[PDB]
Every structure is written in C-alpha cells, then in structure tokens.
Symmetry: C2
Subunit: 919 residues, 2 copies
C-alpha cells in the first residue's frame, strides 16, 4: 500500500533522454494514484498483488531470467475468476495510463536543434525532424527551388489518410474525453508557478478521472465500428486541419509568399474503409455500406451546424457588398446583420440535409426535398464564398481570414460526408459473377478462359453498346452480394466514395471485369478501379499489367490520365518474408512510375497496413522521403492503422505533428528525391532477396510441422474462435498458412513477443551476403547510412526487436508446445538471435534502438504491464486447452471454463495495446 | 502612422506598481494595433488626428492647463459629421481596449503577501485582501474560533447579489465573447517560451479580433434589457459558482474540516431588478414582468440541458444501487448505462419545461402539461440526488464529487429561474389605489387619514375575513398598473420572485398597505415586503417604523421572524449630502438591529446603488467588514451596479475573486466585528453631520439659481430628452429629480458634486473648533473602518475628478452671471480634497493604493478627449450663434446627436461607479 512504482522504472531507464524528460515522473504520478484507487475499492491485498506483478515483470526486463515469470504465472492461475479479471484489467488500465503519459511527454517536449546532425537521418524521429517551414526553407536555399515553385507544388499536393477499423479496441468518444481530461490534469499539475490550492484541486480531479476510467466497461455492428472510427475526427482532426493550414500560411510568408494557401486547396483529405471493405468479410453487406454513407453525412451536417452557429455569433457586421445585401433582403433575425441572415439560411439547409439523411437511414425514404437541403459541395460553398467576398470587398479581409477561412478549409477538406468511402472486394468474387453471366447466356465459362481470352471478351463488351447483365440472372448469396453492392453504389451520390479496390489482383482482366460490372449494374459515375498487388509474383508483373491497361483505348478514355494502385506490406511479407517484399515493392514502384510516365498517366500509390509509411511519429517522415524518385509527385494515400491512430490523432499537438509530417515529407520528395541506388546495392538486394525468400519459405511453407507449432506457440486458434478480428481469419476452412490472412498472421506472433513474420529471412540474407565476400559487410553499413530505403527498412526491424523478447516466446513454448516440437521452437529462437545481432552490426549499434533513445525509453516503460499480461496469457491458454493441468485455487481477494475467456480477451487487448504496430 | 502610444502613458505613471506590472505594455499593444487598423480602413490622416487627440489629452493630465483642451475642441468641432462619429467612436474603442488590459492585469496579478501590513486596512485592496482560506485561518488562529464554529457559520450564510440594468451600455453576449478572445490573445501572446510562429499567428488573431469589435455597431425593450443583463451569468457566473464552492471545500480541509460544504447550502444567490423594478418607469408593465420571468426559466432550462448532456457523456458507469437500478429499468439508450437513462429522462423533462415556457411566452397558453415538466426545485433534485447517493453507495463518491456535485450546487444556487425577481414600486402609488378603494366604498379618503388612522384601518382589514377590492373599481392607468402587477404576481410561481420593495417608504402603513393589496389581488403566497428608506428623516424614524411593525400581532405572524430592509446611498446622499447620509445610515443600521434583536426578528439589509458596499474589487471587502456590529449575521443583499458588472463578472478570475470577496467578508464580520465607535467619534460625527447637511442644502436647496447652473454646467437636459436612462428623469425642485440623473450628470463633467459637497465644511469646522480634533480625525481614519471606507470612496472619486475639465464646461456653457458661482463650487472642491488628504495623511490622491491610482489615470486620456468633445458639442447643440469653421473630410443638427451619445457612453464607461 505504501511504496511508489518509480524505483522499478528507474531500473529500466537510468537517466533522462532530455532536460525536460519527465516521463517516469508522469508514469509514477498516474500509476501510484491508480493503485491507491485500486486499494480503496478492492482492499490492500489485491493492490499489493497487482503491484508485485508489476515489480516481478519489471525485474525481468533487467535480468532476462524466465523462472521469475513462472513464479508469477503460478500465482496468477490460482486467482478466483473475479480476481483474475480484476488483476488483468488493472494491468491493462496501468498500461493505458502509461501510454497517456507517453503522449503528454511527446506533445510538450521542447524541440532542441542541437540534436540534429543534418541529412536524411534527422527525419526519422520527431525530436529531430523538420517542421513545415524548415522544409520550405531547405527547398528554397539548399535544393534551390523558387518560392513560387514551392507555392505551386503545395497548391497541387494532396495527401489522403485512410482510416481502418481497430482490430481489438473500440475507441468510444466518451473514453477519448476521459483520456483528454487525464492528460490535461497532468500538464496543468506540472505548470510553473501553480498555487497550493490549484494543485490540491487538480490532484483531486486527476484521481477522480482515473477512477472514472477504471469504473467503465457482443462485437459491434459495422455501423457502430464506423461511428467509433470517426471519434478522432470529432475530437482533434476537425479543428486540427484549419490550425495546420494556418501554419502553412505562416511558413509561406516566411519564405516570401505574400498570400495564403488558397482555401480550395485540398492539401489533406480523409477516407475510410469501415463499411466499404468487404474482402472476406460477409457482415459488410450492401445495406451496411448505404448506412455508413448516410451516417457520415449526418455527422458532417452536425459538425457544420456547430461551426456555422459559432460563426453567426461572431459575424455581427453590418457593412456588406451589394450581392450580399440583395440576397439578405430576399431572405425575409435582425435585417441589419446580413451575414447572420445568410448563415442562418445555410444552417437551415444543413438541418434539412441532416434530417433527410436520418429519414433515408431509418425508413429508406425522405419527404424532405433535396432542393431544401445541400446536394452538392458547390451549392454549400456558394453562400459561404459570398460572405467571404463581401467581407473582402468592404476591407474586412482580415476578419474573413479568421473563422470563415477555417470553415471554407473545412468544407474543402471534409466535404458533406467527412470521409470518402473506399470499396474493396476480392477479384475471384468478380470472376464468379462474370462466369455466372457467361454460362447463363450460353457463351461458355469465363473462369476457364485464359487471361488473353478474358481481356478480348471484356473489351468487346466494354466497346459494344448492348447491355449484358440480365435481371433474370440466377444468383448465389455471394454473387447477389457483389451485384447488390454495385447497385448501392449506383444509388448513392458519387462524392460519397473513393476507389473500388480489387484484393488479390493479378492481371488486367481483374480491373476491366470491375469496370464492366460497374456499368452493367448502372453506376453512371464509375469509381476508379484500383488493383491491390499482394503476392510477390503479382508485384513483379504489376508494371506489365498497368502497361496493358494503359495501352487499351477504352481504358485510357475511362481513367483520364489518372490511375491509383495499392501495395501491401503485411500482405507481400506473408508471401515471401519482409526483406524480399520490401525490395520487390521498391522495384515495382519505380517501374510502374516508368510505365505511367511513358503513357502520360499520373500514378498514385496507396500504402496498405504494415508499412514503413504509416508508422507512428517521426519514422513516417523519413519513410515517405525514402520512396523511389518521382513516384509521389504530390499525390499519395496512406492507411492510418488502428494500432497507431491514438498516438497519431488522440491529442491536439500529436494531430498537428502528424498532419505536418505527411505534408512536409510528401512536398519535399517531389522536389528533392533520395539518391538513386548504385548498381552494387541493387545486385546485393537481388541476391539477398533470393536467400531471404528461400529461408522464409523453408520455415513457413516446406516444413511439415510448422502449422502444428504455430497453433500451439500462438493464441491464433483462440483469436479466431472468439472472433476478435470481427472477420474470418482464413478464406478456406483448410489450406496452408497461405490461406490465412495477414492480420491474424501478424497478430498471433506479436502476442507472444516473437514477431517471426517481420524478421524471418533477414538473418539468412545478412549472413549470406557477409560470408560470400569480405567487402559486402562494409557495403551493407554504407547502405544503412546512405540509402534511405535500406535505412527505413532496417529501422522497422530494429523497432520490432525492441518490442520482442525470446524469453517470453520460450515461455509460451515450454507450456504449450509438445516435447517433439520444442527443438523446432529453439531453432526459430536461434534464428531470432542471429538476425538481431547481424542487424545490430550493420548500422553499428551495440544496443537495440541506440539511434533513438526517446523511442527506446517509451517502448521499454510499457513492458512491465505487457510482460505481466504475457505470462497471464500463456498460463490461461494452458488451462483453456488442457483439462488435466491442475491449479491451486487461492481464496478471494475482494464458452470456456469460468473466467478464462474474459481473462484471455483482456490479455489480448492489453498486449495489442502495448505492441501497437509491428509488421 | 509611426510611433507608439506608450510614451504618453509612461508620462502619467512612470514606475511599475509590482514586479509583474505590464499594464502600459498591454495598453500599448492593443491601442497601437487598433490605430493601425484605423489607418488601414480610414486613411493616415484620420489615424493621426485620433492619435493627436490622445496625446493632447494625455499631456493635459500631467500639466493641468486648459488652453490645451480649447484648441483641441476647436479641431473637434471642425470635423464633418461622419468624421466626428468616427473619431468619438475610435476614442471609445480605445478606452474599451484599455479597460480590457486592466482586466487582464488584475486577473493575473500574482499575490504578494509581503504587501500585507496586518489589520483591517489590508482588506481594502485586492493586492492585500485575504482569500477564503486566509480568512478561515485567521478566524481560527487570530480570532480564536473553532473550525466547527466556522463550518457552522458557512452552512448558515447567504449572500445575494442583485443585478440591475446598465444605464448606458448593452452588454450583448457576442460582445462579451469578442472581449474574451481579445483578453485570451493578450495573455497567450505574453506566455513564456512561446514559439515565433505561435506568436505570429496570435498577433494576427489579436489584430483580427480588435477589428471585429471595431466594425460592430432604438432603445431596447425591457425584455431585451433583461437578457442582456443575464449574459454575465451565461459567460462566467454559471461555471464560476461551482469553482468557488470547490475552493471553499479546499479551504475547509486546510483548517481541519474533513467534509465538503453540503451541496444544499445556498452560500451565494442571484437576484434581478430587470422587469421587476417599476419605480417611476411606466414601461415595465405587468406583462413585462410575466415575460422576463418566463425568459429566465427558458435560459435556466437551456443551461441545465447542456450541463446534463455533458454529465451523461461522463457517467458511463454500470454499477449502481438498487433504487437507481429499479427506476432505470422502469424507464425503458442502452440499459447497462443506468446513470445515462436517468439523466436522459431529466433532460427530456427539462426540454418540456423550456418549451412550455416558450409557449406561455408567445401565446399565453401551453398544451405541454406541468406533469411532463419540472415545476419545483424538489422534483428536479430527486433524480439528481438519486444519482449522487447511488454513486456513493458503490464506493464512487469521488466520481460523484466531480461534475455531478457541480450540478447539484448549480441547482441550489440558481434554481429553475437563474435569478429571483425583485418587485419595486413607489409608496404613493399604493396609497392611490387604496384611496380609490375607500372613496368608491364610501368609507372616506385613505389619503386624508393620519398615519395612526391608516394603521388602524389597515389592521382591521387584514384581521378581518371579508374581501375588499371590488372587481368593478374605477381604475386610472396607474392604478390599473399596480393592480395588474399584483395580479401577475398571483399567477406566477412563488419561486420566481424575491421581495416587494417599497420606494420612498416613510411609515408602517406603507408596508401594511402592500400586504393588504397583495392579499386582495389574490397573491396566495405573499411576497416579503421590504421598505426602502431614502430620505434621512425616513432613516431616523426607520427604527421606530420597524418596531411598530414588529409590535403588531398580524405582521409578526406574517413575517415569521424575518424582515428585510433596503437602504440607499445615492438616494440619501441626494437628500442631505454624502457625509450626513453615511452617518445616518450607520446609526439606523445599529438601531434597527437592536429593535430586531429585542423582538426576535432576523434583519437582513439590502444595499442599494452608490455605496461603499458594491464598489468594484477590494473596497467591497473592507466595506462589508466595516458594517455595524451584529447587522449581518450571515445574511446580506448587495446591488451589483451595472457600472461595475464588467469588472466584477466579465472574466473568469475576476468572477472568482468577486464571489470570494463577498463570501469571506460576510463570514468574517459575523465572528470578527469592527471596533465599536468611541463616544468622541460619535459626537464628532454628529456635529460634522449638521454642518455638512447645512452646507449641502445651502448650495442645492437654498440658492435660487442652482437649477439654472445645473442645467447649463452638465448635460442633464440632453440626457433626459434622449432618454439615455430608459426612464423618466413632473416638474418641481431638484428634489423631484431621481438619483441616477443627479449622479450621472455631475459625473459626465468630472466634477462629482453629489459625492463630496458638504464634506469640507464639516472637516474645516471640526478642525477649527478644537485643536484636539484634527488628531482625532486622523485616528478615526486609521482605527474606524466605517470612517475609513467612507473617506476612501471620496478619495477614489476625487481621483476621477478634474476641476479644469469642469471649468471648461462652465466657460463654454454657463452664462457670465453664474460663472462666479461655479468658481465658488470649484473652490469648495479644492478645499474638500485638500482637507481629505490631510486627515488621510496622504500627499496625493490614492497614495494608499497605487494599483487603483494607476488603473484610473491610464483611462483619463480617452475620457478627457470625450469631455472636450462633449462640452463643445453641447454648446453647438444649444447655441445657433456659436460659429465653427468646417474642416475638409478625412476618409438636433447633423451628427451632433450621435456624437453626444457617444461621449456620454464613453465617459460613463471610463468613470464607472462614483456616488
């Protein structure tokens, strides 16, 4: 009940990483108060049990000795069911608090330019990266671009951030606000010259908010999961984008541009997969898609109604131009406040816009006319731009450039739906539909046809003028879902959507199949069709596939010089290992850009989950700068993984830094590409890729006992049976691991702190390269320090190794895998150790993350809570799986068998929360 | 276009009054940016004209030479009409900006205990006064009371602040928010370790907000006037009351009490006169009163709906006690969120309460049932206290003591109507009604009867059981308004009202007559009747009046041991001068408390306009402490003058300090009374009061041409015919003129005759009567809080005065025959000031409070400019022969009316409270 937890933290990180480093102080302040709440509510004994768990696990990091973990697991398994949930949830809440303190520290850390050493490596951490104006200054003076060149590059830039559902955590809006109050109490408490009484009251508030978070807690609807994905837009991003665009104005002033970024520049846009991605996800029906589109339009309408009402209060002026005065008279509270009369009308039409969507959502029908509401972005902006012009014509541009300019930038960023919905479906599901059509019409089986025959037939249909899809067509459930989805797209406004993405795209016929289905189902404004090239072979042939499409007269007419392609890191890494996937992805990008340049097509890349781009914080800055030259040119899409969305957008300043990161990195790359690889580097990457793929497949594909080990050393099977992914874990009820999807592949191996999908293959490749020529070792480290692609790739592996622990993995082994396969597990752990130390010698580090002590400190302070949940998980699995393993039921301390399922969910949630992004 | 305005301000106050004194820097930041905006929109010529006006006036303060101002006035009268409005409004906006920086400066001044010298004098300024915690610690350790004594005193304490309309200024809610953004930009701009880009953008923001205030322009309804008066409640007081009560909890903990102040303690309450006061105000009809009552209930429902919705977001818990779980089940969005289920129902009934009020306001009728809404504070409280007890029963009292405790404290502070409405009406209007009743019934003329006969008749009616008021009584417009008003009181919920105040109350029959009318018009829960004793003769007989009332069996049964009495400072001062009024008020207070103690009645005093109690900032703290011993005992009502409401409640921290002030001073007085006056002090006050009254009446009553001087030397008649006071100012002496115009007109000219006239005859007489007396007057100033606060008010008003400006009005507007009379009055001014400083032991005005001195003088460049503009504008308004050479442009007869109202608004804004 008495001692603080900070002694254990100082053992982990002796020493401050900066002068204003207070992370351990903050962690102690929050956790000590939590434990006191725990004791007040549940008695001293369990408080001391919980703190002893934390102390044991903290000791383990300093002295990697498994037996003390086994001690702890013995104690944990003996707890009564109620106590087990209570201790697991307590450890979870402490991890949350520690993450909140980590957020506060990042947000308020003073930038210290003495940490910069120059060059691209500075851009890999928030402690050293360039802000937007530093980037603007560099482009002008070091690279030699003119201010007007930079200004027009920005005018043509667009970064599209795509939200995807969080696999394990909901993110209720009311919880995001508890988080904020805890963060606010924390910063205010540690203010400069704070009063005794202020500090006393802030302390009581902090204790109050921690308790409130501790005393609050079936899968959610896809509708609900979408509502929860939009919380971060309501809490930071809505207000955040005007604030960042204003900083871009300030930066432009400070390089000599004497005008603001025009308010119609969509510098940042936001998209969503929630309700649109149905790849292997049959709960995402056509109706779900129609719903999330209407839900988004209600959310937008209410956000705008609030902004407009705040603006009405402010714009009390009476001086206006003639166009506004005539319109204000026509709408006829007081007539001598014309800006309020216009905006009052806009609010009226926004209210109708909202109610119309609400009615369509409930009944499917609305007697509120589309005339009385806003149907297009253009008719929404007409009165707003009239207010802006009027203020400017009267010499009040300074007033206009305040809240009204914020609103206009919000309209051009968010539109009438906040986010544009991406649609995604698997290519073979489209083939199924087309085969159904061809057989029913009696012209054969489209599935049996070769790729060239498919293209020939599709093109004759696309070029012909006679319809194809009979309403009579006999339909499976899956075929009816595909057709029904297209029918929904045809019925909804085109501005609700972005692209239609084809999972597992392999050839041009996959793209033109969707183009034909779109048209024959009546989508009169078709969606851009985006192939997702997942396997290594598909990436290798992607430039050929894109060239064939660009060589077809019909398709060039359709796309109007714009094509989007999606690439997946976790996807391709599951096929051949991360190193080989990384290198083929680089080559595919540079050759696809070459194809696009020859054919006059502007090619935009969409970066899927598990990438270097899309990491939390600074690493994304360098990752974008590291992409092949001339592959961005002001247009890029990046998924915002649910695992990092809290750190990227949960807090005002973190949101700002994220928007600035993507904007600055994208802008600089277009005018300042990284160095082109020299032939020695390409040859080495080529040779290492062969070795890495071979050894990855040697463990993953060609070893007969791999799946049996995987199902024992990981909690996969439980993850699937509990539907923690709200999605089937596999496409076929059998198959190899090739049928398993990426999310479960990465999830299961990071739960055990082993992370095999991220690093396997790298060890074989590094040792092969060094051993075949004495020179190769020096050229590898030269690559690490001069080639951003290689640097960024390896830094990802370093971060994952900091999150890994072979001892914990071996703990899962000893209790869950059969004797026969335990030597296989230690073989894998041998591969782990050899990859890590080879990784360290390249890059020239003696310790993991020696180049980023800030990240090292932040990661290390999470592990006491994580490792505790690790041993709780491993022992919970053994109880779940073995009726004969005996436990000593200890007396209380104030599906599956009792409590075990709840405990396991809690460990899964907590470990995922602590591990965030891996591969 | 070029140089900053801070040079001219340094000239008036060179030195810093504290380490963190940045007031001149702030004034310069705001005004330099304003002047650049002025130039950007209207050209350099006009900007440089406006700045030249400022510097001329700023130079005049340092070198009191009238020639300066005359040449400025020549320039001002030359302006074309559009330029004149534009220059006067510019000067006004700059004064507003200077006031905003003064607000920022007071709000964020770091407390410095080394300034304290111990004793009651520390409580006269915010820089030295005791917080609530230092007050509790002093009561325990310096006075020697126990912590549980102090805790019990707080539980029984009620301070009620009464809002009254602002005579000249709107206070729109959108303006208060522009003010807030300017202040916020100011403080954020001067935060430490601010980044260059943050500073750049904040600067742009501050420029943008100043411009927005500059490009925002019939008198208002009494209804609109009321919702403008409620804006301060929406902006700071609503959130401020729970903040302060939480500080009271912290203070209690730090003296040994380990429980919070119970949430049902009404430590602070709020009242309004807006729509209730109809004294000499024929608009303010019965329906006006009905309207502002329903408007208040709508505003309350809106505020509660917002608080409840934020609370629902927070209270996600699922563990509750049995009582709540049962009622949550009966209300059946998700059922595992019981606290949200209950609060959702509360919100529904609040929505109904609002809509019902809106319907009653528009049509007079509502199909929305009273059952589906909240009609009493008790049924509103029932589900909220259920939530509180449920959270406590589950070991979550810590969560309950957060936002939910804030909400319960708001309910017990504001009720369902935010404020309670005071009704006020003159006593002769009630006599008119009763004389119409007695003549119509053939009983005779109630007006002709002596006071004894009136009481005899009224008491036989109130004791009788037969009704009196015939429904076919012939009614004049005035009589119908009185009866109609009472009829509205009978129709509205009792908790909408506070007391019925009788202006010009003279005798018990005034109080008893209202009790009879109230009953005869059907008010079934009568309002407490409080007399307002205004003339000094009425204050001297006030104790006999309340003793006669307390000796009547019927009235004792009605009041149930509680009586409220109202006293007026500006009212009594207009009768016989401020010094005699102050001393008569003191004796009346101690004599009424003595009567009250003898009859077992709890006497609550209500302090009206123009007092020491009710000044802005620290002086109110000492003023309350200076009240006669045993006249508060935890119960006091104070007027919040509209002149000081911005400085008291406009900003978060100022609101906090205001509530803390009234609470701490009231609490302490009940357990630490001031010294009792020594017999020598009483005898000296008695003799000075005679001399002061006779000197005041010799100028105001007994000099035949005083009204002619008054109507020329001040803008009184223009203030009347423009109805700047929203109220009549029939034709008699000066005795028929109301108090607000009497103070307003003399404050515009910077002369302030009503506040000081008489004081110097009294001081001169006392000193010259006996050589011991000067020493005694100095000891009274250092040892008698009553005398100290009385003279500190005079000192503050002299700081705001300037005889040169008053002489400038004279020279321009007074006939040659009366100019020597004005010179005699300015002689009386200079003599009173000099004698005042001698007794206070000061070489200069406000030498005892350099913080107040600095704040006042930095306003004078803007005020003085408008003074010059005003004086010359009036002579143009009054004289067709006065010639002006029209200057070419720089961008009543034309423009003169609008410039005059602009000067009146600006001067009043800068002068705030005087007498």
């Amino acid at each position: 009940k008495h001692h603080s937890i900070d002694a254990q933290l100082r053992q982990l990180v002796p020493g401050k990483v900066s002068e204003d480093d207070k992370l351990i102080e903050y962690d102690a302040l929050l956790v000590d108060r939590f434990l006191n709440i725990l004791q007040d509510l549940h008695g001293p004994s369990l408080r001391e049990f919980v703190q002893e768990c934390y102390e044991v696990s903290a000791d383990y990091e300093g002295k990697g000795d498994t037996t003390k973990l086994g001690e702890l697991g013995a104690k944990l398994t003996g707890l009564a069911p109620a106590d087990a949930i209570l201790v697991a949830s307590s450890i979870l809440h402490m991890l949350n608090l520690a993450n909140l303190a980590e957020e506060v520290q990042i947000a308020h850390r003073r930038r210290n330019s003495k940490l910069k050493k120059g060059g691209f490596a500075d851009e890999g951490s928030a402690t050293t990266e360039s802000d937007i104006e530093e980037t603007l200054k560099r482009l002008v003076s070091e690279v030699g671009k003119s201010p007007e060149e930079v200004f027009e590059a920005l005018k043509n830039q667009t970064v599209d951030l795509v939200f995807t559902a969080h696999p394990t955590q909901s993110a209720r809006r009311s919880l995001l606000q508890k988080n904020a109050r805890i963060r606010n109490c924390l910063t205010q408490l540690n203010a400069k010259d704070i009063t005794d009484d202020d500090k006393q009251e802030l302390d009581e508030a902090l204790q109050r908010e921690i308790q409130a978070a501790f005393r609050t807690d079936a899968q959610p609807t896809p509708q609900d999961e979408m509502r929860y994905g939009m919380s971060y837009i309501h809490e930071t991003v809505w207000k955040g984008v005007p604030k960042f665009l204003r900083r871009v104005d300030t930066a432009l002033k400070n390089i000599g541009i004497n005008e603001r970024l025009p308010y119609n520049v969509s510098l940042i846009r936001f998209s969503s997969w929630m309700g649109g991605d149905r790849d292997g996800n049959p709960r995402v029906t056509p109706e779900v898609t129609r719903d999330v589109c209407l839900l988004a339009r209600m959310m937008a309408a209410n956000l705008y109604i609030d902004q407009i009402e705040e603006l009405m209060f402010e714009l009390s002026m009476w001086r206006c131009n003639d166009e506004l005065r005539v319109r204000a008279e026509e709408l006829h509270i007081p007539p001598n406040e014309p800006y309020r009369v216009i905006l009052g009308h806009v609010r009226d039409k926004l209210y109708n816009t909202r109610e119309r969507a609400r009615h369509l959502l409930a009944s499917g029908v609305s007697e509120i006319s589309a005339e009385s509401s806003f149907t297009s972005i253009e008719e929404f902006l007409e009165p707003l731009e009239l207010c802006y012009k009027s203020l400017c014509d009267c010499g009040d541009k300074a007033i206009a450039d305040g809240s009204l300019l914020d609103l206009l930038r919000q309209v051009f960023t968010f539109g009438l739906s906040l986010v544009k919905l991406d649609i995604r479906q698997e290519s073979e599901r489209h083939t199924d539909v087309i085969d159904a059509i061809t057989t029913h019409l009696g012209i054969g089986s489209y599935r049996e046809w070769s790729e060239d025959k498919r293209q020939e037939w599709l093109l004759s249909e696309l070029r012909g003028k006679r319809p194809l899809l009979p309403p009579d067509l006999p339909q499976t459930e899956e075929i009816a879902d595909v057709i029904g989805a297209f029918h929904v797209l045809a019925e909804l406004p085109p501005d609700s959507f972005g692209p239609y993405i084809i999972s597992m795209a392999t050839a041009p016929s996959d793209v033109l199949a969707v183009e034909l289905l779109q048209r024959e189902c009546g989508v009169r404004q078709p969606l851009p069709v985006v192939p997702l090239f997942e396997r290594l072979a598909d990436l290798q042939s992607a430039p050929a596939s894109v060239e064939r499409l660009f060589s077809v007269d019909w398709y060039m007419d359709r796309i109007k010089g714009k094509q989007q392609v999606m690439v997946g890191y976790s996807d391709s890494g599951k096929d051949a290992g991360r190193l080989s996937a990384a290198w083929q992805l680089y080559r595919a990008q540079e050759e696809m850009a070459q194809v696009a340049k020859r054919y006059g097509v502007k090619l935009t890349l969409f970066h899927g989950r598990g990438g270097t781009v899309g990491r939390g914080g600074g690493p994304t800055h360098l990752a974008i700068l590291s992409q092949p030259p001339d592959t961005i040119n002001g247009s890029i899409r990046v998924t915002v993984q649910g695992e990092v969305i809290e750190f990227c957008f949960g807090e005002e300043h973190l949101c700002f830094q994220t928007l600035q990161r993507f904007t600055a990195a994208t802008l600089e790359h277009g005018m300042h590409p990284p160095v082109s690889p020299k032939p020695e580097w390409r040859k080495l990457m080529d040779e290492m890729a062969v070795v890495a793929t071979e050894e990855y497949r040697s463990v993953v594909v060609k070893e007969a006992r791999f799946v049996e080990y995987f199902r024992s050393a990981t909690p996969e099977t439980e993850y699937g049976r509990m539907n923690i992914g709200s999605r089937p874990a596999k496409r076929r009820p059998g198959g190899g691991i090739t049928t398993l999807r990426a999310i479960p592949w990465i999830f299961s191996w990071t739960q055990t702190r082993f992370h095999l999908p991220v690093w396997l293959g790298v060890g074989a490749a590094f040792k092969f390269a060094i051993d075949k020529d004495v020179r190769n070792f020096q050229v590898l480290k030269e690559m690490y320090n001069e080639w951003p692609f290689f640097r960024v790739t390896l830094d990802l592996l370093e971060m994952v190794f900091a999150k890994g622990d072979p001892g914990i993995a071996g703990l899962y082994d000893e209790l869950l895998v059969a004797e026969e396969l335990k030597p296989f597990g230690k073989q894998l752990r041998d591969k782990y150790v050899e990859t890590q130390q080879l990784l360290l010698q390249i890059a020239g580090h003696k310790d993991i993350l020696e180049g980023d002590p800030f990240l090292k400190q932040g990661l290390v302070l999470r592990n006491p809570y994580i490792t505790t949940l690790n041993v709780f998980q491993a022992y919970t699995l053994k109880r779940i799986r073995d009726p004969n393993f005996k436990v000593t039921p200890q007396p209380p301390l104030s599906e599956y068998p009792p409590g075990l399922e709840d405990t396991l969910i809690l460990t899964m949630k907590g470990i995922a929360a602590g591990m965030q992004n891996t591969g």
